[PDB]
């Protein structure tokens, strides 16, 4: 289906002397594939996916050198922003960046991405045209005007439509066996008697990959909207995900309710109900 590549970068300024921490995390199809952390004893980009071992020592040295430069760029940028917002001198602040590309099933570029956050809030974003900028506030407009003047979008557009797409094509080929793999959810219904002659019916979906899933509860083939409790999709910690959806039903009427699980990894949507033990 569709593909993506992202680099999630964070620079955190620390109290007084200790110098900012710089972290860069690379993703291919929402899965971590590389990581750099300035706090490491020997800071370098390291493989985080087994298919990344295919890259020679030169890839890692080049990537590490880019991170060393990025760390310095974020130091200067954090200082400039401190002066725009007048928090000025030596406090604890965050600067974040997201960049990358989205590809179609035909591997053609759908969209380029470039965004910044200061203190976890939107600061400046490159528009979908990859030519113009949207600043979030007055201080970010100083950055926008600086970047409009120096034609910064042009070099970002070149990476996003070029190297970003080119390297993602390479990674998709090298990690083909891994990236194409789906893990089907294993579903079951739990039964939790409560007050007023009612029972909670909980439909669990476990062991699935990717995280994208839909769990629906129906009363005699009719969808149940706001009356349904859901947990946010959560990692199992083994590469798979979990999710559950529950409904409060009257005791004795459990067989009128059905749960359906929709996942790209499934041969067809699952249909299940409370299976009482004998």
């Amino acid at each position: 289906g569709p593909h993506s590549m992202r680099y999630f970068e964070t620079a955190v300024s620390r109290p007084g002397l200790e110098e900012p921490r710089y972290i860069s995390v690379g993703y291919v199809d929402n899965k971590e594939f590389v990581r750099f952390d300035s706090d490491a004893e020997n800071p370098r980009y390291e493989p985080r996916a087994p298919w990344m071992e295919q890259e020679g020592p030169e890839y890692w040295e080049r990537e590490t050198q880019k991170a060393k430069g990025q760390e310095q760029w974020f130091r200067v940028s954090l200082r400039n922003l401190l002066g725009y917002y007048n928090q000025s001198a030596g406090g604890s602040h965050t600067l974040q960046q997201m960049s990358g590309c989205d590809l179609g099933s035909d591997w053609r570029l759908l969209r380029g991405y470039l965004q910044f956050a200061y203190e976890g809030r939107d600061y400046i974003a490159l528009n979908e045209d990859l030519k113009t900028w949207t600043a979030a506030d007055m201080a970010a407009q100083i950055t926008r005007r600086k970047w409009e003047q120096s034609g910064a979008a042009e070099h970002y557009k070149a990476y996003l439509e070029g190297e970003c797409v080119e390297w993602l094509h390479r990674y998709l080929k090298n990690g083909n066996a891994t990236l194409l793999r789906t893990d089907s959810p294993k579903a079951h219904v739990t039964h939790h008697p409560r007050s007023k002659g009612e029972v909670t019916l909980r439909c669990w979906a476990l062991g699935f990959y990717p995280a994208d899933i839909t769990l629906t509860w129906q009363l005699n083939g009719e969808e149940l909207t706001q009356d349904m409790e859901l947990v946010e999709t959560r990692p199992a910690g083994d590469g798979t995900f979990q999710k559950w959806a529950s409904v409060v039903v009257p005791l004795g009427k459990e067989q009128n309710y059905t749960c359906r699980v929709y996942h790209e990894g499934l041969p067809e949507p699952l249909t299940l109900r409370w299976e009482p033990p004998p």
Binding site: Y7, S24, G26, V34, Y45, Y59, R62, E63, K66, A67, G69, Q70, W73, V76, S77, N80, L81, L95, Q97, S99, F116, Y123, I124, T143, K146, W147, S150, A152, H155, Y156, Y159, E163, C164, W167
Partner: peptide, 9 residues
């Protein structure tokens, strides 16, 4: 592969 920023903020 990662991108390098040039012009600072």
């Amino acid at each position: 592969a990662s991108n390098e920023n040039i012009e600072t903020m």
